[PDB]
Design a protein around this ligand. Structure first.
Ligand SMILES: CC(=O)N[C@@H]1[C@@H](O[C@@H]2O[C@H](CO)[C@H](O)[C@H](O)[C@H]2O)[C@H](O)[C@@H](CO)O[C@H]1O
Ligand code: CA
Ligand code: CA
Ligand code: CL
Length: 218
């Protein structure tokens, strides 16, 4: 059968809307290969990604969280631009070169099979489930204790991926999205097909949530 990941329960008053975001610096080797190949090291997603420090965070990240910026005209240099309004983050970022971690919970609107689809420039990792993304109600502490990727998308050669999970309406599923841009254009597209649906959506409104971190499977 299809994969059936593990989820979490919580009283509605311990639940709030949307994901948490952390933004981390990702420098060029030099500013006018110019780009840093570090993002390719296997230890980068687990510990290396924090080594240039962070620069911002947000909460309640909900709705239309994908983007495709291919309008930039210059490579090998930092370009300032804004995230979608879904991110509740007002400052411009070095959209040319940065790392982001989005985490929290995905709650399906009905029981059944969900297909996710990702498209990356440069790099997207997808962890999903309480035995794959992070522990129920213990997100801060366990965020980098993720398991083998549910999907691994990397530009140019493996930039498109998909994956299928059978989900239950009553459950909040730990979800962890890792994104990196090494240089220039940036694509973070994460979409899904709910059950019996042939048309993809990139709008997560009503699917994304955060449970309080009380260490006890809630
Ligand atoms: C080093 C550099 O800037 N090379 C250029 C290409 O840059 C890459 O662009 C792809 C998208 O096509 C990715 O975003 C990748 O992360 C970038 O390093 C770029 O496509 C072309 C367009 O002029 O110029 C190359 O020199
Ligand atoms: Ca944070
Ligand atoms: Ca890029
Ligand atoms: Cl799981």
């Amino acid at each position: 059968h299809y994969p059936r990941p593990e989820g979490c329960s919580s009283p509605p008053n311990a639940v709030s809307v949307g994901l948490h975001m952390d933004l981390y610096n990702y420098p060029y080797l030099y500013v006018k290969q110019c780009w840093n190949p570090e993002y390719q090291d296997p230890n980068f997603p687990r510990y290396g990604y924090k080594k240039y420090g962070s620069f911002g965070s947000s909460d309640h990240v909900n709705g239309k969280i994908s983007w495709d910026h291919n309008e930039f005209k210059e490579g090998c240099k930092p370009i300032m631009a804004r995230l979608p309004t879904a991110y509740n983050y007002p400052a411009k970022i070095t959209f040319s070169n940065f790392t982001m971690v989005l985490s929290g919970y995905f709650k399906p609107k009905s029981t059944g099979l969900y297909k996710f689809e990702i498209h990356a420039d440069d790099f997207i990792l997808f962890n999903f489930g309480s035995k794959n993304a992070f522990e129920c109600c213990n997100r801060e502490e366990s965020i980098d204790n993720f398991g083998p990727y549910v999907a691994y998308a990397m530009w140019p050669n493996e930039a498109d991926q998909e994956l299928e999970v059978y989900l239950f309406e009553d459950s909040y599923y730990p979800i962890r999205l890792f994104y990196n841009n090494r240089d220039y254009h940036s694509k973070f597209m994460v979409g899904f097909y709910p059950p019996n649906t042939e048309e993809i959506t990139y709008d997560f409104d009503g699917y994304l949530y955060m449970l309080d971190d009380t260490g006890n499977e809630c």
